[PDB]
From a paper:
Septins are GTP-binding proteins that are involved in important cellular processes such as cytokinesis, membrane trafficking and microtubule dynamics. Many of these biological functions are dependent on the intrinsic ability of septins to spontaneously polymerize into filaments, which subsequently assemble into higher order structures such as rings and networks that are capable of membrane association. Human septins 3, 9 and 12 are the only members of a specific subgroup of septins that display several unusual features, including the absence of a C-terminal coiled coil. This particular subgroup (the SEPT3 septins) are present in rod-like octameric protofilaments but are lacking in similar hexameric assemblies, which only contain representatives of the three remaining subgroups.
Two structures were obtained in the presence of GMPPNP (in space groups P1 and C2221 at 1.8 and 2.12 Å resolution, respectively) and one with GDP (in space group P1 at 2.19 Å resolution). Both of the P1 structures are isomorphous and have four monomers in the asymmetric unit, whereas the C2221 structure has only one. In structures that contain the GTP analogue the γ-phosphate is anchored by the Mg2+ ion, one water molecule and Ser58 and Lys62 from the P-loop, Thr89 from switch I and Gly115 from switch II. Furthermore, Phe116 (the homologue of Phe128 in SEPT3) is always observed in the buried conformation. Both SEPT12G–GDP and SEPT12G–GMPPNP (space group P1) form filaments within the crystal lattice, employing the NC and G interfaces. The filaments of the GDP and GMPPNP complexes are effectively identical. Since both structures have four monomers in the asymmetric unit, there are two crystallographically independent NC and G interfaces. If these are dubbed NC1, NC2, G1 and G2 then they will alternate in the following manner along the filament: –NC1–G1–NC2–G2–NC1–G1–NC2–G2–. Whilst the two independent G interfaces are very similar, the NC interfaces are not [Fig. 3(a)]. One of them is in the classical ‘open’ conformation seen in the remaining septin subgroups, whilst the other is in a shifted closed conformation. Finally, the shifted arrangement (which is also closed) is asymmetric and is seen only in the SEPT12 complexes, where it is present as the second type of NC interface (NC2).
Numbering used by the authors: 48 to 81, 86 to 316
The structure:
């Protein structure tokens, strides 16, 4: 069961740390055993399993942008990767016809990391998000959210949500794809919290008898899978549990078909 994720965002926002956090989550039956500034695109693939649901999960890690003087076209490698997977899938459909034998490398969701400035969406992130949402599912997150208080996280989230409407950035789950009243009720709860205020952690700690992922500070451990500490469980549950199939369905029937229709002509 193939599912492909990609992390995107400014350098130094915890993207690579979040990749390891996803694979090391204590909700999987078992975790794979065993980073600095990312210099190349690289994908990790591991068969993970939650109670009943087995997954071949791929997470593509990307070099961060926004450090040079001029960041024009810093979206090309990432957009290039996304369209390459659509191209491979289309060429496989042309050649072998039956999807049973086509490995699905298409990016089913992009997790876009927003700097926890507490202000509003930066023009560079707006430009990147507008280009990304045209071709792939995008779930934005407030990165390294432990640097904001709970109240600051919420106010920043509300401003980002306003910015997304102003610049017409339709992030996942898009309201136009709510197929039912049940979908509207469930997806409105998710849209209320997006962007999730996430914290990443690749280290495990023993806290009150529990082996948990966390960031150890002078004041204690920030437990990244604890809803009282951050909203990583919301991102994790969305991607792997509740909306995995919907993300793949939109990728196949909306984004990939848009690529297939255009390129075939
Ligand atoms: N406070 C805090 N620090 C974090 C968090 N996640 C990662 N960090 C720290 O932030 C730094 C950068 O982490 P990293 O994952 O390498 O960021 P990156 O986005 O992968 N960088 P790049 O794009 O340049 O590879 C490290 O010191 C890491 O320990 C987080 O949720 N909170
Ligand atoms: Mg990195």
């Amino acid at each position: 069961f193939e599912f492909n994720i990609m992390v995107v965002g400014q350098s130094g926002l915890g993207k690579s740390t979040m990749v390891n956090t996803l694979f090391k989550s204590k909700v999987w039956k078992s975790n794979p055993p065993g980073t600095p500034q990312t210099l190349q695109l690289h994908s990790l693939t591991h068969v993970i399993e939650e109670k009943g649901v087995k997954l071949k999960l791929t997470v593509t890690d990307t070099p961060g942008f926004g450090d040079q003087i001029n960041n024009d076209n810093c979206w090309d490698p990432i957009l290039g990767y996304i369209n390459e997977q659509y191209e491979q899938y289309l060429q496989e459909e042309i050649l072998i016809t039956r999807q049973r034998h086509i490995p699905d490398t298409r990016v089913h969701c992009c997790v876009y990391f927003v700097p926890p400035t507490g202000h509003c969406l930066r023009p560079l992130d707006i430009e990147f998000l507008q280009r990304l949402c045209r071709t792939v599912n995008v779930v934005p997150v407030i990165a390294r959210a432990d640097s904001l208080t709970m109240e600051e996280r919420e106010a920043f989230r509300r401003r980002i949500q306003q910015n997304l409407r102003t610049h017409c950035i339709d992030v996942y789950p898009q309201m136009c794809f709510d197929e039912d009243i049940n979908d509207k009720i469930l997806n409105s709860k998710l849209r209320d919290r997006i962007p999730f205020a996430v914290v990443g952690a690749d280290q495990e700690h023993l806290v009150n008898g529990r082996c948990v992922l966390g960031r150890k500070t002078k004041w204690g451990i920030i437990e990244v899978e604890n809803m009282a500490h951050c909203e990583f469980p919301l991102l994790r549950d969305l991607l792997i549990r509740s909306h995995l199939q919907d993300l793949k369905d939109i990728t196949h029937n909306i984004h990939y078909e848009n690529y297939r229709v255009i390129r075939l002509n």
